């Protein structure tokens, strides 16, 4: 799959993270990210996708070694970690045709797994609007503990 790049933006308290909500297949909440273009560097793709989805330019804040990368179904997603962005920042996507809404969420309240259906003796996982964000949550919490503590 084509690699994706984007950001985990945190506020100044390190409490909250910025998520975006798309439409249709992308209808839940997730970190801002998207597919790398031909010959485009990872940092440039992250900034481009993040500015397209949120209107905030991370270019001056990216740190090369500060990211979480996950491979999910043989597609690689790398989110650069961007702390210290004020919660009163005005975020506005490029077009509302791709992004419904943009919100801060408390890290400690976000799930780091979906719930099973063991109450119903049924296999699988219950729907969860944070599905796309969930895989990054435990790694982010561990990364923040190691880097700030
Ligand atoms: C089917 C499972 C999914 C549910 N939500 C998905 C998703 O990607 N939401 C985040 C997002 C990322 C980039 C955007 F441009 C717009 C929204 S995918």
From Swiss-Prot:
Phosphorylated at ser-249 in a MTOR-dependent manner. Expressed in brain and testis. Not detected in heart (at protein level). Residues 1-131 form the Nudix hydrolase domain. This is m7GpppN-mRNA hydrolase. A motif (Nudix box) lies at residues 34-55. It comes from Homo sapiens (Human). It comes from the Eukaryota. It is found in: Cytoplasm, P-body; Nucleus. Mn(2+) binds at residues 49, 53. Found in a mRNA decay complex with LSM1, LSM3, LSM4, EXOSC2, EXOSC4, EXOSC10, PARN, XRN1, CNOT6, UPF1, UPF2 and UPF3B. Forms a complex with DCP1A, EDC3, DDX6 and EDC4/HEDLS, within this complex directly interacts with EDC4/HEDLS. Interacts with DPC1B. Interacts (via N-terminus and C-terminus) with TRIM21 (via N-terminus and C-terminus). Associates with polysomes. Interacts with LIMD1, WTIP and AJUBA. Interacts with DDX17 in an RNA-dependent manner. Interacts with ZC3HAV1. Interacts with APOBEC3G in an RNA-dependent manner. Interacts with ZFP36L1 (via N-terminus). Interacts with NBDY. Decapping metalloenzyme that catalyzes the cleavage of the cap structure on mRNAs. Removes the 7-methyl guanine cap structure from mRNA molecules, yielding a 5'-phosphorylated mRNA fragment and 7m-GDP. Necessary for the degradation of mRNAs, both in normal mRNA turnover and in nonsense-mediated mRNA decay. Plays a role in replication-dependent histone mRNA degradation. Has higher activity towards mRNAs that lack a poly(A) tail. Has no activity towards a cap structure lacking an RNA moiety. Belongs to the Nudix hydrolase family. DCP2 subfamily. The gene is DCP2. Coiled coil: none annotated.
């Amino acid at each position: 799959g084509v690699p994706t790049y984007g950001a985990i933006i945190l506020d100044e308290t390190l409490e909250n993270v910025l998520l975006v909500q798309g439409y249709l297949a992308k209808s839940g909440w997730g970190f801002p990210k998207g597919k790398v273009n031909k010959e485009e560097a990872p940092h440039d793709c992250a900034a481009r996708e993040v500015f397209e989805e949120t209107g905030f330019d991370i270019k001056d804040y990216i740190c090369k070694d500060d990211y979480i990368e996950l491979r999910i179904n043989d597609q690689l997603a790398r989110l650069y970690i961007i702390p210290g962005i004020p919660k009163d920042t005005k975020f506005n996507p490029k077009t509302r045709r791709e992004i419904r809404n943009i919100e801060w969420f408390s890290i400690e309240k976000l799930p780091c797994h979906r719930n099973d259906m063991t109450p119903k003796s049924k296999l699988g996982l219950a729907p969860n609007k944070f599905f796309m964000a969930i895989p990054f949550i435990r790694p982010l919490r561990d990364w923040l503990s190691r880097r700030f503590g």
